[PDB]
Design a binder for this molecule. Structure first.
Ligand SMILES: CC(C)CCC[C@@H](C)[C@H]1CC[C@H]2[C@@H]3CC=C4C[C@@H](O)CC[C@]4(C)[C@H]3CC[C@]12C
Ligand SMILES: Cc1ccc(CNCC2(F)CCN(C(=O)c3ccc(F)c(Cl)c3)CC2)nc1
Lengths: 215, 331, 277, 51
């Protein structure tokens, strides 16, 4: 049966190709980028049709980051397609606290939805908070109380940024198996890839600790 | 206006029926219960399976996986025949040409990719790219090697000409994202379900919504055409399935049970149309009866949600593909 | 009446060990989600314990019941060699598991890039090479008594290569793992909830390391300290036959206990059992 | 609007048949195709391509 032998050879080579492709794709850090619009996705991509993939290597560690901003439709009908990504890089522009409800509140709602999501119960979120200098200018020109009415701190970097970070951390409900890595980013902060590398290594380490029963 | 005009249609919905299909169909003997066995099992994919489509030869079948692969099998001998890599690994639909010379796919990239199969050199190259949709390509169905009908997440279906590469016709009217698409046997019309709990019957030649049915109460996920051609079946996330009639313009039968609380991912019909098979989020594929609304067996579950199924045109087999990267054949 | 109770009580233990190891191997073979490097190491350990409890345990029980080893002398040598092969292979499986956990916990970059099933295959091959090279020297060089060689040279060589060097390896590897995991848990840390979770995780890692090290120590240490001291003081201290047999079977129970620690406590194996039954 | 009302204007001008007639047609199709339906009755293994 020459035809059957050829079919068996074709199946064997197809299985080999599938296995090698799976091995290649297993050693890649899958990241899901987000943000409620002009939260700094372009800046984050530049410093590092329907879905955009950025494949970059740092310290011999590969990251493949997927942005679905151009995909405007019902999220729940495709969000599960990203179940199993290594981490979620949620981007929020600090300058959007006063802009209009608020873009900050829209970002908080999206963050809550994709954080407490049932396909993302045990995945970590690497939260970015962009435009710190613009945030400082905006808090000097107008108070933060517009975004958060129940606030009594001063219009300085420390208190305002700390309150924003705390508010974004409080949205997390899976404290048992996920943690948020908040960072503050400007147009000149070159430590963002270092921070994402640290977060990825930390989550991999915690996963190994859980697998061996030591976490 | 439109809301007032819908009143007479709603009144006719109950005036033309004034009864239920169970009374008419309660005079026939139920067919013997069938215990389908997993004849073949297809392995080779590494991620969740999102779609499959039987070939018209009843033997080959294509399958789309989130790993970035579109595999083509030969279910009679279980051996692989093709494995097409993808530009985007976020594929959520696939289709087989009735001629078998083409295979479609698509997903979050908002572009329906057509792959030719009558290549002498033995590999696969994209014959055409159709990126006129602004949403994820939920479904696609070939009419021939020249024209296709896709349905995307931008609340729009589209009749594409492959050679032209542009939308020959655009079907608008769905409020939500269109998730399902079935073709009439004569291909003069087709029916498409969306997330607004509505299934619309569109004429391909004129590109106008000839009929509309609002039976479902949740997002429709699957749809199929009855072999007669004057009826179709629809399955949604409301843990129920419905049958609608083209000529009667009314929902005939509702398939539901207390042991089903999850959504329906795929539906299909048998050779005679007597049995309706539907795959659910609870790992199972249930075989119903189109004339009695009673189950005729539950297929042994996969390890994950069964995302697609397909009954062969000759009714000789039933394939089910699930999110565990396995394709089970039942006969 | 005394020879049938001691036979049924050992046969029950042998049956329990065989069923446990067989269940672990069956769960690994009949599951696609349990085929990873960690579970490959655990399943190789389960196969080694199955070999122990199937080959060397029935004959050990026969020797314990029938006080006289009437099954020849070359057969006794063969069974002793197989026993000191399989037991040291189990110990080095434990050490390989510890070393792989250390690599995964210390180097995320290696864990992602270079990790492959070939690593587990190499670990198992090294374990079995050590086992064979420890078992073969007795083969190279009272009839009703089957005992290991009591030469001081090979005695100290085998005891160090099979329990003392592996003991130091596991101790240092798991200590560095303990410090690394403590560092990770402290780095991860309202604030009271976070510190309570950190303390709970610290107690959990302490308990897990304690279980692993106790299973190693309480099983094999009483056997190996005796195997080290008795050949040097043959007549200074009397070694009761009952106490020696209890120590030997305490060491033997490590093969039975290994699945209960590495697989029957593992969530993936529990899920596989629940799905297969 | 005009487009929205046109989407359903032709729906009123459609011919609806009796549900009893539709059920009779479905029954006729099922009974005329019940014999050639491998999923209804267990197909003999001689002609079954999945022995
Ligand atoms: C549950 C785990 C820890 C394994 C089982 C450990 C215990 C129950 C086993 C291990 C070795 C066993 C001993 C081995 C040999 C003898 C000698 C004879 O007089 C029969 C009983 C006695 C004294 C056994 C009693 C039970 C025993 C101590
Ligand atoms: C290096 C090394 C040496 C010894 C061991 C474990 N050695 C355990 C025993 F010392 C226990 C008592 N023994 C028996 O009861 C027995 C008697 C006859 C037999 F045929 C068998 Cl198979 C066992 C002999 C083996 N690990 C590593």
């Amino acid at each position: 049966s020459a035809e059957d032998k050829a079919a068996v050879e074709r199946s064997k080579m197809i299985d080999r190709n599938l296995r090698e492709d799976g091995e290649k794709a297993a050693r890649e850090v899958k990241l899901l980028l987000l943000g409620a619009g002009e939260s700094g996705k372009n800046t984050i991509v530049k410093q590092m049709t329907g879905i955009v993939e950025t494949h970059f290597t740092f310290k011999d560690l590969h990251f493949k980051m997927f942005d679905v901003g151009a995909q405007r439709s019902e999220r729940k009908k495709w969000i599960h397609c990203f179940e199993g990504v290594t981490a979620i890089i949620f981007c929020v522009a600090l300058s959007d606290y006063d802009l209009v409800m608020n873009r900050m509140h829209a970002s908080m709602k999206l963050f809550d939805s994709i954080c407490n999501n049932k396909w993302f119960t045990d995945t970590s979120i690497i939260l970015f908070l962009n435009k710190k200098d613009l945030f400082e200018e905006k808090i000097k020109k107008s108070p933060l109380t517009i975004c958060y009415p129940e606030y009594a701190g001063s219009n300085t970097y420390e208190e305002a940024a700390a309150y924003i970070q705390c508010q974004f951390e409080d949205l997390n409900k899976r404290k048992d198996t996920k943690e948020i890595y908040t960072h503050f980013t400007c147009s000149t902060d070159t430590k963002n890839v270092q921070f994402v590398f640290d977060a990825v290594t930390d989550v991999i380490i915690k996963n190994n600790l859980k697998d061996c029963g030591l976490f | 206006e439109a809301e007032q005009l819908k009143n007479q249609i709603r009144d006719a919905r109950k005036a033309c029926a004034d009864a239920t299909l169970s009374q008419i169909t309660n005079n026939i003997d139920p067919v013997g219960r069938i215990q389908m066995r997993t004849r073949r099992t297809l392995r080779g994919h590494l991620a969740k399976i999102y779609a499959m489509h039987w070939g018209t030869d009843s033997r080959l079948l294509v399958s789309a996986s989130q790993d970035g692969k579109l595999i083509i099998w030969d279910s009679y001998t279980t051996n692989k025949v093709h494995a097409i890599p993808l530009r985007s690994s976020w594929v959520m639909t696939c289709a087989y040409a009735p001629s078998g010379n083409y295979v479609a796919c698509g997903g979050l990239d908002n572009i329906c990719s057509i792959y030719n199969l009558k290549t002498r050199e033995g590999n696969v190259r994209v014959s055409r790219e159709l990126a006129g949709h602004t949403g994820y390509l939920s479904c696609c169905r070939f009419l021939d090697d020249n024209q296709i009908v896709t349905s995307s997440g931008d609340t729009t279906c589209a009749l594409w000409d492959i050679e032209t590469g542009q939308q020959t016709t655009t079907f608008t009217g769905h409020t939500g994202d269109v998730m399902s698409l079935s073709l009439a046997p004569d291909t003069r019309l087709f029916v498409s379900g969306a997330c607004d709990a509505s299934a619309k019957l569109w004429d391909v030649r004129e590109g106008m919504c000839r009929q509309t049915f609002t039976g479902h109460e949740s997002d429709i996920n699957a749809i199929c055409f009855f072999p007669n051609g004057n009826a179709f079946a629809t399955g949604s996330d409301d843990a129920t399935c419905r049958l609608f009639d083209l000529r009667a313009d009314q929902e005939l039968m509702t398939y539901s049970h207390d042991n089903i609380i999850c959504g329906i991912t795929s539906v299909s019909f048998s050779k005679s149309g007597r049995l309706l098979l539907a795959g659910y989020d609870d790992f199972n594929c249930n075989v119903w009866d189109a004339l009695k609304a009673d189950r005729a067996g539950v297929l042994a579950g996969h390890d994950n949600r069964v995302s697609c199924l397909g009954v062969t045109d000759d009714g000789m087999a039933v394939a089910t593909g699930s999110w565990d990267s396995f394709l089970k054949i039942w006969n | 009446s005394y020879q049938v109770i001691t036979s049924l009580l050992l046969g029950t233990l042998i049956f329990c060990a065989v069923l446990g190891n067989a269940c672990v191997v069956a769960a690994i073979a009949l599951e696609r989600s349990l085929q990873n490097v960690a579970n490959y190491l655990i399943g190789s350990l389960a196969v080694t314990d199955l070999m122990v409890s199937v080959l060397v345990l029935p004959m050990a029980a026969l020797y314990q019941v029938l006080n006289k080893w009437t099954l020849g002398q070359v057969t006794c040598d063969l069974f002793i060699a197989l026993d000191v092969l399989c037991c040291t292979s189990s110990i080095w499986h434990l050490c390989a598991i510890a070393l792989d956990r250390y690599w995964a916990i210390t180097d995320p970059i290696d864990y992602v890039n270079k990790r492959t099933p070939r690593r587990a295959a190499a670990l198992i091959s090294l374990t079995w090479l050590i086992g064979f090279l420890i078992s073969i020297p007795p083969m190279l060089g009272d009839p009703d008594a089957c005992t290991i060689s009591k030469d001081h040279g090979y005695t100290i060589y085998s005891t160090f290569g099979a329990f003392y060097i592996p003991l130091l390896l596991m101790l240092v590897l798991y200590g560095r793992i303990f410090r690394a995991a403590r560092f990770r848990i402290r780095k991860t840390v309202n604030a009271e909830a976070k510190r309570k979770m950190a303390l709970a995780r610290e107690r959990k890692t302490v308990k897990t390391l304690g279980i692993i090290m106790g299973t190693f120590i309480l099983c094999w240490l009483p056997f190996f300290i005796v195997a080290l001291v008795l050949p040097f003081c043959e007549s200074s201290c009397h070694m009761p036959t009952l106490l020696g047999a209890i120590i030997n079977w305490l060491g033997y129970s490590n093969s039975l206990l290994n699945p209960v620690i590495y697989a029957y406590f593992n969530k993936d194996f529990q899920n596989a059992f629940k799905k297969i039954i | 609007a005009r487009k929205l009302v046109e989407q359903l204007k032709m729906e009123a001008n459609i011919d609806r048949i009796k549900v009893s007639k539709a059920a009779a047609d479905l029954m006729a199709y099922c009974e005329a195709h019940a014999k050639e339906d491998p999923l209804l009755t267990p197909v003999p293994a001689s002609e079954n391509p999945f022995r």
